[PDB]
Amino acid sequence: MKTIEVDDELYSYIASHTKHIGESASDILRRMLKF
Amino acid sequence: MKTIEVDDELYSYIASHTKHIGESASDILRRMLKF
Amino acid sequence: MKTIEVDDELYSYIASHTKHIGESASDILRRMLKF
Amino acid sequence: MKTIEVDDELYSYIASHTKHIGESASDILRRMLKF
Amino acid sequence: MKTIEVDDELYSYIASHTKHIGESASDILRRMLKF
Amino acid sequence: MKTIEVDDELYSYIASHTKHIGESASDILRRMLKF
Amino acid sequence: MKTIEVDDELYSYIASHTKHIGESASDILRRMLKF
Amino acid sequence: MKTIEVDDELYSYIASHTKHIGESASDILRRMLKF
Ligand SMILES: [Ca+2]
Ligand SMILES: [Ca+2]
Numbered sequence: 351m352k353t354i355e356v357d358d359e360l361y362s363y364i365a366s367h368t369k370h371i372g373e374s375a376s377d378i379l380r381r382m383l384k385f
Numbered sequence: 386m387k388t389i390e391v392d393d394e395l396y397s398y399i400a401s402h403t404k405h406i407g408e409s410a411s412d413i414l415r416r417m418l419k420f
Numbered sequence: 421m422k423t424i425e426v427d428d429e430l431y432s433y434i435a436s437h438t439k440h441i442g443e444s445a446s447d448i449l450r451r452m453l454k455f
Numbered sequence: 456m457k458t459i460e461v462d463d464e465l466y467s468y469i470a471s472h473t474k475h476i477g478e479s480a481s482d483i484l485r486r487m488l489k490f
Numbered sequence: 491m492k493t494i495e496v497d498d499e500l501y502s503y504i505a506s507h508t509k510h511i512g513e514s515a516s517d518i519l520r521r522m523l524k525f
Numbered sequence: 526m527k528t529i530e531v532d533d534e535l536y537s538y539i540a541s542h543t544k545h546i547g548e549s550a551s552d553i554l555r556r557m558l559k560f
Numbered sequence: 561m562k563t564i565e566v567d568d569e570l571y572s573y574i575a576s577h578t579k580h581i582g583e584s585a586s587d588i589l590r591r592m593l594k595f
Numbered sequence: 596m597k598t599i600e601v602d603d604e605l606y607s608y609i610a611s612h613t614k615h616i617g618e619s620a621s622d623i624l625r626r627m628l629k630f
Contacts (some may be wrong), residue, residue: 352536354529354581357551361406361527363560368403369426371396371413375406375529382558385538387431388426389445389476396422398455406529410424418452420433431476438473441466441483443495445476457501459494459515466492468525481497485524490503536581542588546571546585546599553581562606564599564620571597573630585599592604592628 365366367378379385391399402413414420426434437448457480461469496504507518519525531539542553566574577588601609611612612623 351530352533354531354536354539354550355526356405356529356554358527360551360553360554360560361529362396362404364529365403365406366401367394368400368406371410372407376532378406379531379535379554383538385535386425387428389426389431389434390421391424391449392446393422395446395449395455396424399424411427411430414426414430414449418431418433432474435473435476436471438470439467440475441470441473441480442477448476457498458493459496459501459504460491461494461519462516463492465516465519465525466494468523469494480494481500484496484500484519490500537579540578540581541576542574543575543581545579546575546588547582550581561600562603564601564606564609564611565596566599566624567621568597570621570624570630571599573628574599586602586605589601589605589624 364378364382367382368379369381370377390403397420399413402417404416405412434445434448434452437452439451442446469480469483469487472487474486475482504518504522506513507522509521510517526552539550539553542557544556545552570584573581576577576586576593577592609620609623609627612627614626615622
């Protein structure tokens with residue numbers, strides 16, 4: 351696992367894309383990025 | 386811990402209210418209900 | 421339909437908001453939120 | 456199953472005693488009375 | 491006025507608590523519940 | 526600034542998208558997402 | 561520190577070799593060369 | 596054309612790889628990276 355820092359606005363943006371409650375940031379980003 | 390059944394639309398609505406990536410449904414609902 | 425987990429205290433809190441005997445969690449939560 | 460009439464206030468009072476989402480009025484009243 | 495359905499056994503139980511002939515289910519329950 | 530965890534593979538994937546040497550993860554992700 | 565000029569295509573090529581977000585051109589080039 | 600910042604030691608290292616007097620940094624780096 352690696353740590354990344356994002357600006358507050360970008361963090362909220364990512365968190366709001368949660369589709370499965372409690373899922374990791376990796377699952378969200380992978381879904382948003384199509385990766 | 387108790388399990389609850391909600392319709393799909395309501396589930397997505399709740400999940401989209403995640404403020405802290407990976408937080409539980411309890412933390413989201415408590416925040417949404419101000420309880 | 422989707423399933424979610426909530427702490428015992430929160431579950432009781434929601435249950436106690438029943439206004440129509442035998443109604444679903446969705447009906448209760450949707451009323452509690454204003455949606 | 457038999458049907459009984461109750462005043463609005465009494466109905467709300469009973470409904471608010473729900474402990475298990477979706478449970479019947481018989482389960483609630485039996486719990487409230489101890490029988 | 492609201493309608494509630496109770497199991498046969500519970501209905502008889504409630505009816506047997508009549509203290510004033512011809513009284514409503516609300517009067518009986520209110521008395522049995524101390525409400 | 527807030528901190529998020531990402532799997533190693535995802536980190537490398539994001540890092541490789543650098544277009545301006547030394548730029549932040551926020552600049553990269555915002556570009557990758559279009560927001 | 562010293563400054564050098566590189567064609568756009570080469571710059572992008574180097575940038576894309578970022579392995580640690582926000583690292584300097586020196587860190588990237590030194591890794592790419594084996595030095 | 597884009598500008599890059601490198602440490603002094605790395606700059607001298609690159610300059611010492613000149614094969615054609617007066618050639619650019621791009622030509623040297625491209626040759627060194629086989630790109
Ligand atoms: Ca019913
Ligand atoms: Ca940094």
